[PDB]
Design a protein around this nucleic acid. Structure first.
Length: 48
DNA sequence: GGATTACACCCAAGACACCAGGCACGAGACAGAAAAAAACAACGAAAACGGCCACCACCCAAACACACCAAACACAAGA
């Protein structure tokens, strides 16, 4: 939940996500990129 | 090859990504691969020349005998 990775406020209008949130976003991007290889051309040096 | 190295408290100071090559789409060229034909192997049909049996005659093989030579028990010699 967001409690484990809360955001914060820089100057009254700004927020950066916690490290875990950006890490989870990167994991999601990696997952979707994986689901973009077994659906089309993939010369075995991109799947790995 | 990692992993740990006093405890509490105070203050100040700076940053809170910018910018550059990859995915998609965006089009050519030999290579990844597919289609064809002509000189590659064989077989059917004709021609005549090489192969088989005669005919054939002169040259090599066997018998007879010659003289000649190699050879083998033993009467004699010998230590």
């Amino acid at each position: 939940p967001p409690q484990v990775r809360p955001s914060i406020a820089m100057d009254e209008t700004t927020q950066g996500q916690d490290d875990l949130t950006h890490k989870l976003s990167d994991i999601l991007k990696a997952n979707i990129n994986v689901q973009k290889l077994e659906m089309d051309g993939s010369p075995q040096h991109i799947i790995n």
